[PDB]
């Protein structure tokens, strides 16, 4: 099996603008939603087909109150950290918590904080303490840290319960998550500004969206300057990525195991 | 959750020790508490466990053992002032607490 | 620092019943419990923060409202012997997070009676 994550966000707004939520709470398995909250709704829903069919209507009704709990423990928190701070207005409060599955079969566990998009509280399950940006986050860290069994409770969190909530979502999806599509790969050669050859090497229709692309020059890597394409979404559940460089060239790409080269 | 097992009775010497156990069966966990109810009293909290080892609350220590699903309640130097029964409870993966039938702690003076 | 009220009540069948209970915590969670000889607690209703409520385990021949952050009330809208219990209304500070205990009122007993 290959890396997998799961992770939930929440996202919380002061005096939000008219049409803005006041709450969002989103979950994803790797770069699929697979869970939604949110303030106007008050209901947690699936949002994946494999997430609906898998898990008894229980699920989702009592997440549905833990939501709206956590809901008003974020409206009240991001009130304390504006007064903390003297800011009025309309301001933005973002977690995001979780855990990855390795494919060595090693496990990673985060729990971040962030105030106005910027990083604020970052957990350290290792030492139980929480790392604070600013003496306000050092206000927050202070009182978080003297409950240790919040600590403790957390730590379990995403070790083990996080861990194991993303097994039996994993064996839900396996489906689209577990499944390969492989890369179609072409290499476009073109006369750009008089005088430059433009190699652009594109990779399509593959899944999952990790893809390794580099440029080779006689073998060894190419110390000129290199273009990258962003891994974007090509709406059909494929992505499509690029890398470009100018004038034996080839290009190498490697993806869920195997390897592939377009020589020049 | 689905299961908690602790003994319906226990009887012990003033002055000694007793230790009692709890075992659980659930879907996931997020904690085991130990709760004191007296006789017609409110049960109070007394512990919280979640990972392994043991700690100690005066003549009170609580242990968790993740592996084997268990946990002992140890009280020493017991008084009769213990009398009462013990609430073993387990949150779930979805936070909700699975109770066992709790345990009648009987000292003999 | 949770006030349950009344700490005893005969009531006959068919009667209606409303048990008070506040905390004056800042909680945010709070439950109704029965406990019943043989068995461990179990959750009528519980309400995870101000403005929602949900069933627990027994909640058939109840209702409940939480009225506002300090109160949280059980009804019994046709009382029946099964109902003969002794009622505790519990909070904590959330629902959600796993090392938080529950705070217990001193306990309803009401007696159901043809």
């Known amino acids: 099996m290959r890396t997998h994550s799961l992770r939930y966000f929440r996202l919380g707004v002061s005096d939000p603008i008219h049409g803005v939520p006041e709450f969002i709470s989103v979950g994803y398995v790797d770069s699929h939603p697979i869970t939604t909250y949110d303030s106007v709704t008050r209901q947690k829903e699936p949002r994946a087909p494999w997430m609906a069919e898998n898990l008894a209507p229980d699920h989702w009704e009592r997440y549905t109150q833990l939501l709206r709990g956590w809901q008003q423990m974020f409206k009240v928190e991001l009130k304390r950290l504006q007064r903390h701070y003297n800011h009025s207005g309309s301001h933005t409060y973002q977690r995001m918590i979780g855990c990855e599955l390795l494919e060595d079969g090693s496990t990673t566990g985060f729990l971040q904080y962030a105030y106005d998009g910027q990083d604020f509280l970052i957990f350290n399950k290792d030492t139980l303490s929480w790392l604070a940006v600013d003496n306000v986050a050092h206000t927050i860290k202070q009182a978080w840290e003297a409950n240790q069994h919040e600590l403790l409770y957390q730590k379990n969190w995403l070790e083990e319960e996080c861990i194991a909530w993303l097994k039996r979502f994993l064996e839900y999806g396996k489906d689209t998550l577990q499944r390969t599509e492989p890369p179609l790969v072409r290499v476009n050669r073109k006369e750009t500004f008089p005088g430059v050859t433009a190699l652009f090497c594109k990779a399509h229709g593959f899944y999952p969206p990790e893809i390794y692309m580099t440029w080779m020059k006689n073998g060894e890597e190419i110390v000129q300057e290199i273009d990258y394409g962003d891994i974007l979404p090509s709406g059909d559940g494929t992505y499509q990525a690029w890398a470009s460089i100018e004038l034996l060239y080839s290009c190498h790409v490697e993806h869920s195991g195997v390897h592939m080269v377009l020589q020049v | 959750g689905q299961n908690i097992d602790q003994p319906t009775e226990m009887t012990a010497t003033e002055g000694a020790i007793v230790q009692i156990n709890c075992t659980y069966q659930t879907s996931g966990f997020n904690g085991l508490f130990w709760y004191q109810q007296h006789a017609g009293e409110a049960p109070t909290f007394l512990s919280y466990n979640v990972l392994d080892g043991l700690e100690e609350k005066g003549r009170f220590s609580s242990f968790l053992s993740r592996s084997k699903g268990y946990s002992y309640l140890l009280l020493k130097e017991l008084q009769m002032k213990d009398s009462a029964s013990y609430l073993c409870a387990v949150k779930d993966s979805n936070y909700q607490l699975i109770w066992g039938a709790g345990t009648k702690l009987i000292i003999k003076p | 620092g949770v006030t349950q009220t009344p700490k005893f009540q005969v009531l006959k069948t068919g009667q209606s019943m409303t048990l008070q209970c506040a905390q004056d915590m800042n909680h945010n969670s709070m439950y109704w419990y029965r406990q019943d000889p043989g068995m461990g607690l179990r959750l009528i209703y519980y309400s995870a923060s101000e403005g929602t409520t949900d069933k627990g385990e027994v909640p058939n021949g109840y209702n409940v409202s939480r009225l506002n952050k300090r109160e949280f009330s059980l009804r019994l809208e046709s009382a029946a012997p099964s109902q003969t219990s002794v009622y505790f209304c519990?909070?904590?500070?959330?629902?959600?997070?796993?090392?938080?205990?529950?705070?217990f009122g001193e306990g309803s007993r009401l007696t159901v009676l043809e």
């Open positions: 519990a909070s904590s500070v959330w629902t959600g997070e796993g090392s938080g205990e529950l705070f």
